[PDB]
mmCIF file with all atom_site columns, C-alpha atoms in Angstrom:
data_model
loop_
_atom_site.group_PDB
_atom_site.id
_atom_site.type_symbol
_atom_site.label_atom_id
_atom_site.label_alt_id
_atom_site.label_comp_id
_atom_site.label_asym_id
_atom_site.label_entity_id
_atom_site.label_seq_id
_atom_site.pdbx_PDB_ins_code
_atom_site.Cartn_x
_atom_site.Cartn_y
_atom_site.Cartn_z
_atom_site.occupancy
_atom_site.B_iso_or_equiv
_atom_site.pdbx_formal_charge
_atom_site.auth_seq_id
_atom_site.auth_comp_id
_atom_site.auth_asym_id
_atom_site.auth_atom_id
_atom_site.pdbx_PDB_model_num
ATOM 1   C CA . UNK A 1 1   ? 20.960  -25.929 -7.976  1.00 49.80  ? 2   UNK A CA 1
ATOM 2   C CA . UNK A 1 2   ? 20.573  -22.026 -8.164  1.00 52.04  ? 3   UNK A CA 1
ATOM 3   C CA . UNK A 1 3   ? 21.699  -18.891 -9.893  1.00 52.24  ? 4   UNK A CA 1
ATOM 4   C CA . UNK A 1 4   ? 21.590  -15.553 -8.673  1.00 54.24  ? 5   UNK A CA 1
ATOM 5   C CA . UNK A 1 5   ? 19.004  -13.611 -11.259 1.00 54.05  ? 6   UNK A CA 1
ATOM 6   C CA . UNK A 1 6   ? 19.500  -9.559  -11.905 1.00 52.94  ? 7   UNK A CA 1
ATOM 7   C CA . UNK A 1 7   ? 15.529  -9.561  -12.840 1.00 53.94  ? 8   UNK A CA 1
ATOM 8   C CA . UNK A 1 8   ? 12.902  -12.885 -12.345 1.00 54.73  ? 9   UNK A CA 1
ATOM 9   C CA . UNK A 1 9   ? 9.541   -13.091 -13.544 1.00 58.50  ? 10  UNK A CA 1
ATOM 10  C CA . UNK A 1 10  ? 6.556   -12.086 -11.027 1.00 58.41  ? 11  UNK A CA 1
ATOM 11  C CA . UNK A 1 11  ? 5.747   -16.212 -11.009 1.00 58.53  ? 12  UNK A CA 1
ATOM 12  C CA . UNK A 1 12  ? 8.773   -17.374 -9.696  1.00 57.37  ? 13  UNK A CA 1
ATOM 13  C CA . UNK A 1 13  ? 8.954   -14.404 -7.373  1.00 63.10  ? 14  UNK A CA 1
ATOM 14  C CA . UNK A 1 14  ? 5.756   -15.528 -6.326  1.00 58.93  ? 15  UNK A CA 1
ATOM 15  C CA . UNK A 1 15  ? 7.059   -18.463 -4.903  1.00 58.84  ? 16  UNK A CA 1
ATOM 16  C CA . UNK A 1 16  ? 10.135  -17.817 -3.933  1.00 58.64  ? 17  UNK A CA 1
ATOM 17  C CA . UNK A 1 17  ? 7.857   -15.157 -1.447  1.00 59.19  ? 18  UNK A CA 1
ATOM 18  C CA . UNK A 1 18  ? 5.398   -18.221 -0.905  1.00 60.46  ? 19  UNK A CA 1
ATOM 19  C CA . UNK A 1 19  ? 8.113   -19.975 0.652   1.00 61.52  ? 20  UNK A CA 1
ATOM 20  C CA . UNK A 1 20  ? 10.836  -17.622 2.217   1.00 61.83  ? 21  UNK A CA 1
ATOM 21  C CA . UNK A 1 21  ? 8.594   -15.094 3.077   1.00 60.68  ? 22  UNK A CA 1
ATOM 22  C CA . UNK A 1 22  ? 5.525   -17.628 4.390   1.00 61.79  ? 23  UNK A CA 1
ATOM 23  C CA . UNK A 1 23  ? 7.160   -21.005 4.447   1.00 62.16  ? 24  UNK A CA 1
ATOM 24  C CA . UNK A 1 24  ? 4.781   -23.265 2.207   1.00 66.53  ? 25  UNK A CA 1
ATOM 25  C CA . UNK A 1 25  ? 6.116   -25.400 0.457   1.00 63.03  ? 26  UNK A CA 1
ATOM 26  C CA . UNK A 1 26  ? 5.961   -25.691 -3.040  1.00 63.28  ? 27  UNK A CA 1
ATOM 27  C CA . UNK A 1 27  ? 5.072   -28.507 -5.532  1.00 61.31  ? 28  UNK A CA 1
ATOM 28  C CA . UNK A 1 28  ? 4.698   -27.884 -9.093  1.00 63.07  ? 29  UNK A CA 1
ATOM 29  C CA . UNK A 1 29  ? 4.155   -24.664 -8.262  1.00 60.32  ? 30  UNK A CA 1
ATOM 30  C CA . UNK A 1 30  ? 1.254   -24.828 -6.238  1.00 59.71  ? 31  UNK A CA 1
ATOM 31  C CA . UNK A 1 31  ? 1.224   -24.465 -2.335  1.00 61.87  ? 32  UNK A CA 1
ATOM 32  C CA . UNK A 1 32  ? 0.583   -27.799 -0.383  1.00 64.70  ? 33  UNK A CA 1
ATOM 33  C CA . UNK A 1 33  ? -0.402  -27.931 2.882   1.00 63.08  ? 34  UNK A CA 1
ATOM 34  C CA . UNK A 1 34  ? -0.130  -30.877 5.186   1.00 65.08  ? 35  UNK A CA 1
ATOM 35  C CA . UNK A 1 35  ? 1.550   -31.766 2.707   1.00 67.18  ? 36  UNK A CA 1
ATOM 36  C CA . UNK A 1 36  ? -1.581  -33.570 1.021   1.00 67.19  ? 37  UNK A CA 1
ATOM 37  C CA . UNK A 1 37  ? -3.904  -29.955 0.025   1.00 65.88  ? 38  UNK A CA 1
ATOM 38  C CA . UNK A 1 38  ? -3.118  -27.815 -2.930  1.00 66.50  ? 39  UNK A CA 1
ATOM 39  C CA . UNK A 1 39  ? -3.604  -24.174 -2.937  1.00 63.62  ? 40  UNK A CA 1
ATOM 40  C CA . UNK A 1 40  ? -2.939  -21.519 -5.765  1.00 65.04  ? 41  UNK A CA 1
ATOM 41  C CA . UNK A 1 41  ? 0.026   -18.904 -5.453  1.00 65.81  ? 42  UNK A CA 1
ATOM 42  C CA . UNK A 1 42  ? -1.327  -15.452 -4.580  1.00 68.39  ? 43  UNK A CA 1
ATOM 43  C CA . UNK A 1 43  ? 0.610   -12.893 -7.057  1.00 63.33  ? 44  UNK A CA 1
ATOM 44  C CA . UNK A 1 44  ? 1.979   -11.037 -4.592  1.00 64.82  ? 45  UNK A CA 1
ATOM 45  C CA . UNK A 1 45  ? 4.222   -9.111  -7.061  1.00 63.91  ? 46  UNK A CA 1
ATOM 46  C CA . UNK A 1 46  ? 1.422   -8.173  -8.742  1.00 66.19  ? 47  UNK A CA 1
ATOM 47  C CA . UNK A 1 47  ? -1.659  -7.130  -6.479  1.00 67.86  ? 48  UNK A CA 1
ATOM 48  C CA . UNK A 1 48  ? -0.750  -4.534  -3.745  1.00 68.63  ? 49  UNK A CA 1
ATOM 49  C CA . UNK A 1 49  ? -3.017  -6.352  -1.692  1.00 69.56  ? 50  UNK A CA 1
ATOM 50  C CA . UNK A 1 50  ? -1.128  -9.625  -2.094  1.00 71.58  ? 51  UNK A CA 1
ATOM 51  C CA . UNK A 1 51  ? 1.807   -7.828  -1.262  1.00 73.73  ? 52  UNK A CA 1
ATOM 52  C CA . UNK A 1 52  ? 0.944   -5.845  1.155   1.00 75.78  ? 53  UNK A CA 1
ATOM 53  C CA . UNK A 1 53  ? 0.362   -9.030  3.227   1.00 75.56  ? 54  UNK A CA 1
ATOM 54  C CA . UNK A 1 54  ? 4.592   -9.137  2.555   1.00 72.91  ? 55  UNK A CA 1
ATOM 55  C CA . UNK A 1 55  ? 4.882   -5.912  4.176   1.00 75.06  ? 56  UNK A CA 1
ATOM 56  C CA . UNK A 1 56  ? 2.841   -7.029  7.416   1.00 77.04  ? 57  UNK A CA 1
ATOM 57  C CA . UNK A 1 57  ? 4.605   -10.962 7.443   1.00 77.02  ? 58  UNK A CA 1
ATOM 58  C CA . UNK A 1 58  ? 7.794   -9.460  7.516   1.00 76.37  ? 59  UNK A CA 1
ATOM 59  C CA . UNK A 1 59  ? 9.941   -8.902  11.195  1.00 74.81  ? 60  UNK A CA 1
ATOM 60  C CA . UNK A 1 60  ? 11.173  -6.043  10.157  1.00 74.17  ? 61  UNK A CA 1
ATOM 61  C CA . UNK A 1 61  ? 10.102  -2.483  9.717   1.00 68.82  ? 62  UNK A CA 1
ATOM 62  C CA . UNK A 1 62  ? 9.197   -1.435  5.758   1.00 66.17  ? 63  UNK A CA 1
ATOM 63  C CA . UNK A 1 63  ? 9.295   1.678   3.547   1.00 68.07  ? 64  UNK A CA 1
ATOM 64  C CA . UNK A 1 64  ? 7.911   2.380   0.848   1.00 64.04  ? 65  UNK A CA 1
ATOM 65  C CA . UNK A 1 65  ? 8.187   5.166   -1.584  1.00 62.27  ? 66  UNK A CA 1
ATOM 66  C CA . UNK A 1 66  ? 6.612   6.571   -4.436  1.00 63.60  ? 67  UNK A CA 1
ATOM 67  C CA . UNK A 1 67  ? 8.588   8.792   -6.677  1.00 67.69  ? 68  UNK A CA 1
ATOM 68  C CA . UNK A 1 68  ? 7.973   10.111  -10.350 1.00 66.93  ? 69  UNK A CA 1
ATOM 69  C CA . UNK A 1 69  ? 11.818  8.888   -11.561 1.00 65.56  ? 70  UNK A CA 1
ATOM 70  C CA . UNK A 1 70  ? 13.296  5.923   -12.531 1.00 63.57  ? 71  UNK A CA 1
ATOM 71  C CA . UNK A 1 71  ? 12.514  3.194   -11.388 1.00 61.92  ? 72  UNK A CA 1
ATOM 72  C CA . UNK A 1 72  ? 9.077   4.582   -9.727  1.00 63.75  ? 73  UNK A CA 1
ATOM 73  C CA . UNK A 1 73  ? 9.192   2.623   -6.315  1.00 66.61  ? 74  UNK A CA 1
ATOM 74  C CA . UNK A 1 74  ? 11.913  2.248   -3.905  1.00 66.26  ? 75  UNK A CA 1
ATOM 75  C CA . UNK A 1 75  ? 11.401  -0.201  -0.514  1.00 65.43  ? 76  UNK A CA 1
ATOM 76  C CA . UNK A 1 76  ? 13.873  -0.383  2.463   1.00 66.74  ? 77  UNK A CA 1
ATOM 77  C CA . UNK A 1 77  ? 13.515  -3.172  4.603   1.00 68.05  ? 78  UNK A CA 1
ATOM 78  C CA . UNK A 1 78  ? 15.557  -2.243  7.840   1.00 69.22  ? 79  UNK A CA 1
ATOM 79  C CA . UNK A 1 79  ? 17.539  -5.775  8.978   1.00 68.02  ? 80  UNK A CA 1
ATOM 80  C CA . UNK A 1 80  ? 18.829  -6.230  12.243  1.00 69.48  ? 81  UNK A CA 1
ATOM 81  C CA . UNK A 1 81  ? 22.331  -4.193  11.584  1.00 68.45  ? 82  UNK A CA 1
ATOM 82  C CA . UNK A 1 82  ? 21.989  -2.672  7.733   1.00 69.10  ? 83  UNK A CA 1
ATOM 83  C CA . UNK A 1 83  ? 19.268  -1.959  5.837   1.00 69.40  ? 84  UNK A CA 1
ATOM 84  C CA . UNK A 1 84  ? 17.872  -3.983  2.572   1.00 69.61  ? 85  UNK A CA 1
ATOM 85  C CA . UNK A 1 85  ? 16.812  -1.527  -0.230  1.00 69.18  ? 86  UNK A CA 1
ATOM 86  C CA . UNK A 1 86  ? 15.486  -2.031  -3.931  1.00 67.48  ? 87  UNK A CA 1
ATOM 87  C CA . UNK A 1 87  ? 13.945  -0.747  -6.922  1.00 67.46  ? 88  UNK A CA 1
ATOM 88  C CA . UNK A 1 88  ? 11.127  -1.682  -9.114  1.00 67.25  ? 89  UNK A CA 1
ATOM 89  C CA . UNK A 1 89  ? 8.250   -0.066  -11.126 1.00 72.36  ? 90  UNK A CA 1
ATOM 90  C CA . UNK A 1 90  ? 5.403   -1.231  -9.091  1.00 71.67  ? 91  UNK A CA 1
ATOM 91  C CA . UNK A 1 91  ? 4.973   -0.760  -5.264  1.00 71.54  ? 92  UNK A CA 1
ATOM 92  C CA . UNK A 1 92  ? 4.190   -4.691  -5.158  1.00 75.56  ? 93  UNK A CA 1
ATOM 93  C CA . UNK A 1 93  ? 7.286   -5.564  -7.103  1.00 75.46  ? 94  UNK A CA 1
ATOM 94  C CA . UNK A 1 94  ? 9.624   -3.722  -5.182  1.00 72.17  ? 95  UNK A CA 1
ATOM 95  C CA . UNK A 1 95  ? 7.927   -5.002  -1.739  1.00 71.37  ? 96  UNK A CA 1
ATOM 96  C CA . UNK A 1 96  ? 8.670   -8.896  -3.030  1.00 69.50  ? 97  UNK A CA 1
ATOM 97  C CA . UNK A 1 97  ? 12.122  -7.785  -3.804  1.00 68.73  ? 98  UNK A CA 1
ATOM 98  C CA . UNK A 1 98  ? 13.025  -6.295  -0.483  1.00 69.09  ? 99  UNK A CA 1
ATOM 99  C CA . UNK A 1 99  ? 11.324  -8.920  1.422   1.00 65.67  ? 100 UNK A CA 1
ATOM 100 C CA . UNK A 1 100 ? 13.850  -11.476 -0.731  1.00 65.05  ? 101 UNK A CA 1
ATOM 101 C CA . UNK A 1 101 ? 16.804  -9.186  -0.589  1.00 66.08  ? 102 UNK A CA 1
ATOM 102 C CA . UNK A 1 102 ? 16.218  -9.494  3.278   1.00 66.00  ? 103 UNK A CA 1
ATOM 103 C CA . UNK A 1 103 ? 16.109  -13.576 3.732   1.00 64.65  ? 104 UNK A CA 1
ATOM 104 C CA . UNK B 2 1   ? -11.519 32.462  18.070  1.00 65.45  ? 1   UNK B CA 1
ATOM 105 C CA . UNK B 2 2   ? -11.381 31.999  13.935  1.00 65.09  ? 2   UNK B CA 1
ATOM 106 C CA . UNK B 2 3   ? -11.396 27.940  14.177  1.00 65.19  ? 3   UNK B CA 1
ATOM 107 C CA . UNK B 2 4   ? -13.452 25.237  15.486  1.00 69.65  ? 4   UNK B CA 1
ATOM 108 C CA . UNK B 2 5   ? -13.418 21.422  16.079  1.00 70.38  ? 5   UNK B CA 1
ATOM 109 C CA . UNK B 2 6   ? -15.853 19.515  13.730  1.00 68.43  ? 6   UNK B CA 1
ATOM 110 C CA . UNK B 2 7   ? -17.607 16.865  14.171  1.00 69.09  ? 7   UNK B CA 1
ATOM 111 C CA . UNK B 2 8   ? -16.429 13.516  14.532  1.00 67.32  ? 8   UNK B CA 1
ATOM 112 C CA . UNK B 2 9   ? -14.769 11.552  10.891  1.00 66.02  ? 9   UNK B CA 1
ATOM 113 C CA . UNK B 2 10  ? -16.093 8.313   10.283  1.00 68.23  ? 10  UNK B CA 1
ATOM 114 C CA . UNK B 2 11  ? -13.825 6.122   7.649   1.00 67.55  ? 11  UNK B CA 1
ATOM 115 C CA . UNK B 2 12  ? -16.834 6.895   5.235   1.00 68.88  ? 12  UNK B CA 1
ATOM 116 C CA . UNK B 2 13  ? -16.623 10.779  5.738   1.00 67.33  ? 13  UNK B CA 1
ATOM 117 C CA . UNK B 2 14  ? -12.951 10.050  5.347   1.00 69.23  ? 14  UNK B CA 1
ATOM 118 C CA . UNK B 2 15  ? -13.279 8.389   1.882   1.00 68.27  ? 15  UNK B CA 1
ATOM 119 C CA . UNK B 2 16  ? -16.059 11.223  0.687   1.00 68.92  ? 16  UNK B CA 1
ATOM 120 C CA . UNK B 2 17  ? -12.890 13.614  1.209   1.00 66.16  ? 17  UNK B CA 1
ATOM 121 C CA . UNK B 2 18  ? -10.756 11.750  -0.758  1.00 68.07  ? 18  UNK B CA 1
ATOM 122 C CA . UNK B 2 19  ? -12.879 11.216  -3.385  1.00 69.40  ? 19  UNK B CA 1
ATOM 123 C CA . UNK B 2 20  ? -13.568 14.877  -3.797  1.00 67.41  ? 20  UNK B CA 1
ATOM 124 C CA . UNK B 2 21  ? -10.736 16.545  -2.859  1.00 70.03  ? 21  UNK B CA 1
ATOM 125 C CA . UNK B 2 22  ? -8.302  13.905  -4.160  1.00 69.06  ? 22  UNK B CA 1
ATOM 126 C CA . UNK B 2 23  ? -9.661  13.403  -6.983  1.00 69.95  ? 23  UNK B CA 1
ATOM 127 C CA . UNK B 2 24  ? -12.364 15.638  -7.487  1.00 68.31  ? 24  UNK B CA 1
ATOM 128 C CA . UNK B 2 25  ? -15.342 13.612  -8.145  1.00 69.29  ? 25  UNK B CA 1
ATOM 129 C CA . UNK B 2 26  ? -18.839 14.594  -8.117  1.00 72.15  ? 26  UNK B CA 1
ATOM 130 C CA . UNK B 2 27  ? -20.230 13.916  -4.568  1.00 71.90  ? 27  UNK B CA 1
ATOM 131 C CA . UNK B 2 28  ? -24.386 13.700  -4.292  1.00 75.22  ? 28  UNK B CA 1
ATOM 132 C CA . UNK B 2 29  ? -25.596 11.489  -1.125  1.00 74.07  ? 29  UNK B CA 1
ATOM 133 C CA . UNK B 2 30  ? -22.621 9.454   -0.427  1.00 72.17  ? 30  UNK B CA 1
ATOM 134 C CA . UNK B 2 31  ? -21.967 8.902   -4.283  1.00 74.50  ? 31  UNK B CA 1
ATOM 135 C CA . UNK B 2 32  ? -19.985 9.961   -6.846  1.00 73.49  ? 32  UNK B CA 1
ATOM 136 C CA . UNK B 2 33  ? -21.874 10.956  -9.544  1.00 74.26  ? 33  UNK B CA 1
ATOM 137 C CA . UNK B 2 34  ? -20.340 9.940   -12.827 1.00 75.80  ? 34  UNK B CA 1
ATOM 138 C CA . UNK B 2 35  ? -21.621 12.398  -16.587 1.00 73.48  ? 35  UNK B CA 1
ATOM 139 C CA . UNK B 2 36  ? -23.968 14.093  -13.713 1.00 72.82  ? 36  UNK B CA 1
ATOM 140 C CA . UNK B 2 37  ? -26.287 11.365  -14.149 1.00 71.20  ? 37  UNK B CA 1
ATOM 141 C CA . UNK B 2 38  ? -24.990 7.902   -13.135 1.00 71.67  ? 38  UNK B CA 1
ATOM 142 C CA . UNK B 2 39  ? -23.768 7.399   -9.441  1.00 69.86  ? 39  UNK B CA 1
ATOM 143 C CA . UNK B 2 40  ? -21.465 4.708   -7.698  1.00 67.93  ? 40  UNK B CA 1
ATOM 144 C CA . UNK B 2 41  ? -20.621 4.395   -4.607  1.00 69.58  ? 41  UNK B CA 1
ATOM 145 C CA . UNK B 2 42  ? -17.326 5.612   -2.677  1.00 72.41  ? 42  UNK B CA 1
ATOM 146 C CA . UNK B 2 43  ? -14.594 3.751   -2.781  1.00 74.21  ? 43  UNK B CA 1
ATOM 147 C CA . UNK B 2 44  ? -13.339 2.342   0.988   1.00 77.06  ? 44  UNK B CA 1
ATOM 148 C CA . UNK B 2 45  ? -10.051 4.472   0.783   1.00 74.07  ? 45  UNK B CA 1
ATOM 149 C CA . UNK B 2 46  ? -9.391  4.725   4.355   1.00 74.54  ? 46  UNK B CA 1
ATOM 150 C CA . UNK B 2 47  ? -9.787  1.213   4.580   1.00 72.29  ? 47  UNK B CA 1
ATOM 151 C CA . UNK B 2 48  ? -8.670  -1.138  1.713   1.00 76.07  ? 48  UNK B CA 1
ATOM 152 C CA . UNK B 2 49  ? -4.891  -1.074  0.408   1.00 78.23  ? 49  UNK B CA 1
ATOM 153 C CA . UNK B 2 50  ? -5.588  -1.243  -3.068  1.00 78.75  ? 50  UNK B CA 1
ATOM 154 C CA . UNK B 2 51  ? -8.036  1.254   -2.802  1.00 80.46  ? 51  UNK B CA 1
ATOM 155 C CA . UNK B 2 52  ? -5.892  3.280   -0.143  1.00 79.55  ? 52  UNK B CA 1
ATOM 156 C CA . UNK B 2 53  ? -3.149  2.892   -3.090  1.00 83.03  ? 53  UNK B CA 1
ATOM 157 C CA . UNK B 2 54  ? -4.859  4.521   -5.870  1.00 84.00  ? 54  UNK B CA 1
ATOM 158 C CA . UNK B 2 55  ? -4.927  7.803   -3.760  1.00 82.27  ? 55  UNK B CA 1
ATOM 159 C CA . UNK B 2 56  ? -0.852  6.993   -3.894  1.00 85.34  ? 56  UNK B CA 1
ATOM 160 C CA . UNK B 2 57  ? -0.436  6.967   -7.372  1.00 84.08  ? 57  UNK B CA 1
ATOM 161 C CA . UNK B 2 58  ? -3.055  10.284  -7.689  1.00 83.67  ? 58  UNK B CA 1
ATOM 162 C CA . UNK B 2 59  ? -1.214  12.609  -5.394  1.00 86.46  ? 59  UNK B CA 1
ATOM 163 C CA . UNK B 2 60  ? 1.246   14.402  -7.440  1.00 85.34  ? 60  UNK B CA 1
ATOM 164 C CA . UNK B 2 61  ? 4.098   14.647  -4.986  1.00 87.78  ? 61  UNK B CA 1
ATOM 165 C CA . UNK B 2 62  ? 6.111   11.976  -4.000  1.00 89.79  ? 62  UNK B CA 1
ATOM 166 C CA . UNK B 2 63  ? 4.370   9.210   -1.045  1.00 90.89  ? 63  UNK B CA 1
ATOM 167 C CA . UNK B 2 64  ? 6.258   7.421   1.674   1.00 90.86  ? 64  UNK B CA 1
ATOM 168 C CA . UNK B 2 65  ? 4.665   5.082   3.372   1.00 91.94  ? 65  UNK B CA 1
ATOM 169 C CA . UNK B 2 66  ? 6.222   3.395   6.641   1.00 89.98  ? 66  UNK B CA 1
ATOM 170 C CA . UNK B 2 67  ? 5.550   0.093   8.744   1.00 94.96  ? 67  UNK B CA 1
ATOM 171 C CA . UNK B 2 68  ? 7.486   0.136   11.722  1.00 98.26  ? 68  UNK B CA 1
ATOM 172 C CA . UNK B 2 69  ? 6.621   -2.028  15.344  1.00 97.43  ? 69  UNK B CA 1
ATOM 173 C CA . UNK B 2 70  ? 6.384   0.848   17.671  1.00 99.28  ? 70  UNK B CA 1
ATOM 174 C CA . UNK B 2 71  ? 2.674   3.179   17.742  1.00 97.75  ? 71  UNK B CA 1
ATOM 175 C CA . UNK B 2 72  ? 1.731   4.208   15.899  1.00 96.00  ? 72  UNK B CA 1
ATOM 176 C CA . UNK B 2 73  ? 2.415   1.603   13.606  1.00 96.78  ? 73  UNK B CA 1
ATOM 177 C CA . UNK B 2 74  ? 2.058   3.163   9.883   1.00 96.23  ? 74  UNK B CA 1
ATOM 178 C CA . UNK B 2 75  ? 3.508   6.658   9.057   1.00 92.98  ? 75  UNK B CA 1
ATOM 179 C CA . UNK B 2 76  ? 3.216   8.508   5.698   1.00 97.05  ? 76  UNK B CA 1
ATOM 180 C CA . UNK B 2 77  ? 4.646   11.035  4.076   1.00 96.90  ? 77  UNK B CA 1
ATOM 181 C CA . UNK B 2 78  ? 3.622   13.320  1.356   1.00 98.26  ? 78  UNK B CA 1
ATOM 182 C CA . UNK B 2 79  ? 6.345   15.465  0.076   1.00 102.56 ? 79  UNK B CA 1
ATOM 183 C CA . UNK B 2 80  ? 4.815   19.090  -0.843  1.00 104.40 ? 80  UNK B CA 1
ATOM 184 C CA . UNK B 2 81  ? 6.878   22.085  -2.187  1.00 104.14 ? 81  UNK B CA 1
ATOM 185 C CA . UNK B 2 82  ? 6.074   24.225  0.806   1.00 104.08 ? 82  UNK B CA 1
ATOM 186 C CA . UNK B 2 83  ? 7.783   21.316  3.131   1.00 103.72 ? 83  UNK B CA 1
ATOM 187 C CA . UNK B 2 84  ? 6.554   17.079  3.783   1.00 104.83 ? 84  UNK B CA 1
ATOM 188 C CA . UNK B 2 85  ? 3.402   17.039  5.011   1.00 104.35 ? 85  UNK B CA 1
ATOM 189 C CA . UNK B 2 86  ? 4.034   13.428  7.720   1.00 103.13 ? 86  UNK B CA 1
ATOM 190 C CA . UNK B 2 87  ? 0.634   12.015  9.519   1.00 100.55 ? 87  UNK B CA 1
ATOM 191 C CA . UNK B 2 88  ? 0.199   8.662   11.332  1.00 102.71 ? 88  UNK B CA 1
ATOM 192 C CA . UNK B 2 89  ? -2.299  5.719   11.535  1.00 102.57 ? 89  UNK B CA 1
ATOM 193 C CA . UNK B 2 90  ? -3.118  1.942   12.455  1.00 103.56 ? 90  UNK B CA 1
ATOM 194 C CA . UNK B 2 91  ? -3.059  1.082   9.070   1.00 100.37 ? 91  UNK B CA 1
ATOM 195 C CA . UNK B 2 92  ? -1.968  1.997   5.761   1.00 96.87  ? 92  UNK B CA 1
ATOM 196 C CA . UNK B 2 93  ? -4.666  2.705   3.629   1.00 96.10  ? 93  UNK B CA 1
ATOM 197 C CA . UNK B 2 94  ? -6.222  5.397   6.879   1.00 96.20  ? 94  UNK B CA 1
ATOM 198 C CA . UNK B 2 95  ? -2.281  6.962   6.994   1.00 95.77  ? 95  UNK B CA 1
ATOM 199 C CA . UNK B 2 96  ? -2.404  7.239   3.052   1.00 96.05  ? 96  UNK B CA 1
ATOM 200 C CA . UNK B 2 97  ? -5.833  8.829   3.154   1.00 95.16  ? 97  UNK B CA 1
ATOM 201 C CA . UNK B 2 98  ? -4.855  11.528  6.012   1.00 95.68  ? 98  UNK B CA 1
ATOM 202 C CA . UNK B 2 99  ? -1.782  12.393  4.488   1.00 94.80  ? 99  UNK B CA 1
ATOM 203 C CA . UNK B 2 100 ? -3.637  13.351  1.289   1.00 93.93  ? 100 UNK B CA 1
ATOM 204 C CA . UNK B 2 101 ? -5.987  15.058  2.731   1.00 94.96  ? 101 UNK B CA 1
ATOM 205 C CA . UNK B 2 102 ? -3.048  17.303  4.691   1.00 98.35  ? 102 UNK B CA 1
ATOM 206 C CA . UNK B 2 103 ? -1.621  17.714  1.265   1.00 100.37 ? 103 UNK B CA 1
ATOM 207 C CA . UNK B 2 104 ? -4.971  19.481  0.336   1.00 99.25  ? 104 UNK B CA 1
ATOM 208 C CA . UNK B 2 105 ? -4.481  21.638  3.820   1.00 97.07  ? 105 UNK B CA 1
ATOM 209 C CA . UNK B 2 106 ? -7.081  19.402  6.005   1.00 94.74  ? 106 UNK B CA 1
ATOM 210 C CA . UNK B 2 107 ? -5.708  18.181  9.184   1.00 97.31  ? 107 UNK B CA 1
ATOM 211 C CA . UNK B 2 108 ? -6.720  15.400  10.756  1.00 99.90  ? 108 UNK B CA 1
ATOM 212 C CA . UNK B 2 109 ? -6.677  14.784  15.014  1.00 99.24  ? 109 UNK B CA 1
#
């Protein structure tokens, strides 16, 4: 079962990235590999650095823009035929959220 | 002839611009000297994201950074009054760094 949520908390983002964006899989919240070794979740709606491993995973080509209104960061993700765009306060928050909007 | 080519930019020079003309630290032998008395070293600007980002949030105009598949890969742009200042790069955080620095009217080739 799912729901479509208008705002989710940077955890379950985090996985939701984990596996759409990377394909782990996910158990209890932790990344298993081989499906035997656990791994933490990087916070990739938190840390630009996390994130900006979103920008270079994805296909597609990314933008990413500053601005000093409100909300602060805008991203475009450009799919084949339309173009994916968001909004969020942080640059890392609005990366994860284009990279979903785009799967 | 009024202008000449300088010498080559290493990342490091890169990052001693930033730090100085971006934000307008105290520069003394490859340092930024904090209360005139205590140093640290330069940040890797040019070549670390969330370092490269922090030069994002400074600039006071608004930053567009863009990943795209063809070459050069990363392209930012810095929107100044007079008219967008738009620079490329390899990577992000050396695209962030010279488009500050052409906000602060220092080209980079």
């Amino acid at each position: 079962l799912y729901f479509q949520s208008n705002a989710m908390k940077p955890r379950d983002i985090n996985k939701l990235i984990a596996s759409k964006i990377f394909g782990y899989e996910i158990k209890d919240d932790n990344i298993i590999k081989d499906g035997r070794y656990r791994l933490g979740i990087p916070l990739y709606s938190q840390n630009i650095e996390s994130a900006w491993q979103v920008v270079e995973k994805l296909e597609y080509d990314v933008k990413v823009t500053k601005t000093d209104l409100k909300p602060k960061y805008q991203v475009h993700v450009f799919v084949p035929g339309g173009v994916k765009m968001v909004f969020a306060e942080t640059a890392p928050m609005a990366i994860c959220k284009g990279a979903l909007a785009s799967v």
